[PDB]
Amino acid sequence: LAAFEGPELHRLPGGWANVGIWILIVITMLMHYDSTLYLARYSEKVVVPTAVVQFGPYRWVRHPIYASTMLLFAAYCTALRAPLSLLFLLAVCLVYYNKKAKMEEELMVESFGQSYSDYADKVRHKFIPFVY
Amino acid sequence: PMETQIISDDTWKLVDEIWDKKVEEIKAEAVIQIEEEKKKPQILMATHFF
Protein backbone atom coordinates (compact mmCIF):
# COMPACT_ATOMS: atom_id res chain seq x y z
CA LEU A 1 0.00 0.00 0.00
CA ALA A 2 2.96 2.33 0.57
CA ALA A 3 4.29 1.66 -2.92
CA PHE A 4 0.79 2.09 -4.37
CA GLU A 5 0.09 5.31 -2.46
CA GLY A 6 3.41 7.10 -2.93
CA PRO A 7 4.06 9.32 -5.95
CA GLU A 8 6.30 8.17 -8.79
CA LEU A 9 10.00 7.95 -7.98
CA HIS A 10 10.89 10.86 -10.28
CA ARG A 11 8.17 13.18 -8.92
CA LEU A 12 9.32 13.01 -5.30
CA PRO A 13 11.61 15.96 -4.51
CA GLY A 14 15.31 16.05 -3.73
CA GLY A 15 17.96 18.48 -2.54
CA TRP A 16 17.30 19.80 0.97
CA ALA A 17 14.17 17.67 1.37
CA ASN A 18 16.15 14.41 1.19
CA VAL A 19 18.40 15.49 4.08
CA GLY A 20 15.71 14.83 6.69
CA ILE A 21 15.42 11.26 5.41
CA TRP A 22 19.13 10.71 6.07
CA ILE A 23 18.67 12.18 9.56
CA LEU A 24 15.84 9.75 10.30
CA ILE A 25 17.87 6.80 8.98
CA VAL A 26 20.92 7.60 11.07
CA ILE A 27 18.98 8.37 14.26
CA THR A 28 17.05 5.11 13.88
CA MET A 29 20.17 3.02 13.53
CA LEU A 30 21.85 4.82 16.45
CA MET A 31 18.86 4.20 18.74
CA HIS A 32 18.47 0.55 17.75
CA TYR A 33 22.18 -0.25 18.06
CA ASP A 34 22.39 1.47 21.44
CA SER A 35 19.33 -0.41 22.68
CA THR A 36 20.73 -3.73 21.44
CA LEU A 37 24.17 -3.09 22.93
CA TYR A 38 22.62 -2.16 26.27
CA LEU A 39 20.26 -5.15 26.32
CA ALA A 40 22.78 -7.81 25.25
CA ARG A 41 25.52 -6.61 27.64
CA TYR A 42 23.66 -7.62 30.82
CA SER A 43 22.44 -11.03 29.66
CA GLU A 44 24.58 -14.04 30.56
CA LYS A 45 22.88 -16.48 28.19
CA VAL A 46 21.35 -15.67 24.79
CA VAL A 47 18.25 -14.05 26.33
CA VAL A 48 18.52 -14.27 30.15
CA PRO A 49 18.67 -10.77 31.71
CA THR A 50 20.66 -10.77 34.95
CA ALA A 51 19.62 -7.25 36.01
CA VAL A 52 17.33 -4.35 35.05
CA VAL A 53 18.52 -2.09 32.23
CA GLN A 54 17.83 1.65 32.54
CA PHE A 55 20.48 3.29 30.36
CA GLY A 56 20.54 5.29 27.14
CA PRO A 57 17.45 4.51 25.06
CA TYR A 58 16.08 2.69 28.13
CA ARG A 59 15.86 6.00 30.02
CA TRP A 60 13.62 7.39 27.25
CA VAL A 61 11.45 4.47 26.10
CA ARG A 62 10.82 1.23 27.99
CA HIS A 63 10.94 -0.89 24.79
CA PRO A 64 13.49 0.85 22.54
CA ILE A 65 14.34 -1.87 19.99
CA TYR A 66 10.65 -2.19 19.11
CA ALA A 67 10.26 1.57 18.75
CA SER A 68 13.40 1.73 16.60
CA THR A 69 12.07 -1.02 14.32
CA MET A 70 8.76 0.78 13.84
CA LEU A 71 10.61 4.08 13.28
CA LEU A 72 12.49 2.29 10.51
CA PHE A 73 9.20 1.53 8.78
CA ALA A 74 7.97 5.07 9.47
CA ALA A 75 11.02 6.55 7.76
CA TYR A 76 10.45 4.05 4.94
CA CYS A 77 6.88 5.29 4.45
CA THR A 78 8.26 8.83 4.54
CA ALA A 79 10.79 7.94 1.81
CA LEU A 80 8.27 7.11 -0.96
CA ARG A 81 5.99 9.85 0.49
CA ALA A 82 3.06 7.66 1.63
CA PRO A 83 1.81 8.88 5.05
CA LEU A 84 -1.36 6.74 4.91
CA SER A 85 0.67 3.53 5.02
CA LEU A 86 2.73 5.09 7.83
CA LEU A 87 -0.46 5.47 9.88
CA PHE A 88 -1.63 1.93 9.09
CA LEU A 89 1.68 0.35 10.14
CA LEU A 90 1.44 2.56 13.23
CA ALA A 91 -1.87 0.89 14.04
CA VAL A 92 -0.98 -2.74 13.28
CA CYS A 93 2.61 -2.69 14.56
CA LEU A 94 1.47 -0.87 17.70
CA VAL A 95 -1.23 -3.49 18.33
CA TYR A 96 0.93 -6.60 17.92
CA TYR A 97 4.02 -5.04 19.45
CA ASN A 98 2.09 -3.79 22.49
CA LYS A 99 0.71 -7.32 22.92
CA LYS A 100 4.21 -8.79 22.99
CA ALA A 101 5.42 -5.90 25.17
CA LYS A 102 2.66 -6.63 27.71
CA MET A 103 3.56 -10.33 27.79
CA GLU A 104 7.29 -9.64 28.18
CA GLU A 105 6.70 -6.88 30.74
CA GLU A 106 4.44 -9.02 32.93
CA LEU A 107 7.01 -11.84 32.78
CA MET A 108 9.96 -9.69 33.90
CA VAL A 109 7.88 -7.81 36.47
CA GLU A 110 6.99 -11.20 37.97
CA SER A 111 10.62 -12.33 37.78
CA PHE A 112 12.23 -9.10 39.04
CA GLY A 113 9.69 -7.29 41.23
CA GLN A 114 10.25 -3.78 42.56
CA SER A 115 13.22 -2.84 40.34
CA TYR A 116 11.38 -2.81 37.02
CA SER A 117 8.37 -1.39 38.89
CA ASP A 118 10.22 1.79 39.89
CA TYR A 119 11.92 1.81 36.48
CA ALA A 120 8.52 1.82 34.74
CA ASP A 121 7.45 4.54 37.15
CA LYS A 122 10.52 6.51 36.00
CA VAL A 123 9.68 6.02 32.30
CA ARG A 124 5.95 5.55 31.73
CA HIS A 125 6.12 6.29 27.99
CA LYS A 126 6.29 2.78 26.58
CA PHE A 127 6.89 3.10 22.81
CA ILE A 128 6.96 6.76 21.65
CA PRO A 129 8.41 9.62 23.76
CA PHE A 130 5.45 11.39 25.46
CA VAL A 131 2.96 10.27 22.79
CA TYR A 132 2.01 6.86 24.18
CA PRO B 1 45.18 -55.80 73.51
CA MET B 2 43.93 -52.49 74.88
CA GLU B 3 42.84 -50.44 71.82
CA THR B 4 39.08 -50.46 71.37
CA GLN B 5 37.32 -49.40 68.16
CA ILE B 6 38.60 -46.57 65.96
CA ILE B 7 37.19 -43.95 63.71
CA SER B 8 33.60 -45.15 63.16
CA ASP B 9 31.12 -47.42 61.45
CA ASP B 10 29.39 -44.37 59.94
CA THR B 11 32.51 -42.98 58.27
CA TRP B 12 32.81 -46.35 56.54
CA LYS B 13 29.22 -45.81 55.40
CA LEU B 14 30.18 -42.39 54.01
CA VAL B 15 33.23 -43.71 52.16
CA ASP B 16 31.10 -46.58 50.78
CA GLU B 17 28.61 -43.93 49.67
CA ILE B 18 31.19 -41.84 47.82
CA TRP B 19 32.67 -45.01 46.30
CA ASP B 20 29.23 -45.98 44.99
CA LYS B 21 28.50 -42.45 43.72
CA LYS B 22 31.76 -42.38 41.76
CA VAL B 23 31.18 -45.91 40.42
CA GLU B 24 27.64 -45.01 39.30
CA GLU B 25 28.86 -41.73 37.78
CA ILE B 26 31.50 -43.63 35.79
CA LYS B 27 28.89 -46.20 34.74
CA ALA B 28 26.52 -43.46 33.53
CA GLU B 29 29.36 -41.53 31.85
CA ALA B 30 30.56 -44.58 29.91
CA VAL B 31 27.41 -45.33 27.89
CA ILE B 32 25.42 -42.09 27.48
CA GLN B 33 28.33 -39.74 26.76
CA ILE B 34 28.13 -39.50 22.96
CA GLU B 35 24.81 -38.65 21.27
CA GLU B 36 24.53 -35.84 18.72
CA GLU B 37 21.52 -34.72 16.67
CA LYS B 38 22.75 -31.53 14.92
CA LYS B 39 24.49 -28.20 15.57
CA LYS B 40 22.85 -25.79 13.13
CA PRO B 41 23.68 -22.06 13.17
CA GLN B 42 21.00 -19.94 14.86
CA ILE B 43 21.23 -16.93 12.54
CA LEU B 44 17.44 -16.33 12.31
CA MET B 45 17.18 -15.07 15.89
CA ALA B 46 13.69 -13.59 15.56
CA THR B 47 13.12 -12.94 19.28
CA HIS B 48 15.42 -9.92 18.93
CA PHE B 49 13.36 -8.48 16.03
CA PHE B 50 10.34 -10.57 14.95
Curated annotation (Swiss-Prot), chain B:
The annotated consequence of gene deletion is: Embryo defective. Impaired plastid biogenesis and thylakoid differentiation in embryo. Defects in the photosystem II protein complex formation.
Cell compartments where the protein resides:
Plastid, Chloroplast thylakoid membrane
Which organs or tissues contain this protein?
Ubiquitous but preferentially expressed in young leaves.
Say which family it is in: Belongs to the AAA ATPase family.
The entry describes its oligomerization and partners as:
Homooligomer. Interacts with FtsHi2.
Q: Please explain the role this protein plays, according to its UniProt record.
A: Functions in chloroplast biogenesis and chloroplast division. Required for plastid development during embryogenesis. Might be involved in chaperone functions or play a structural role in the thylakoid FtsH complex.
Instruction: Report the protein name in the record.
Output: Probable inactive ATP-dependent zinc metalloprotease FTSHI 4, chloroplastic
Organism of derivation = Arabidopsis thaliana
Tell me the classification of the organism that encodes this protein: Eukaryota, Viridiplantae, Streptophyta, Embryophyta, Tracheophyta
| Gene that encodes the chain | FTSHI4
Boundaries of the shown chain within the full protein: 806 to 855 of 855
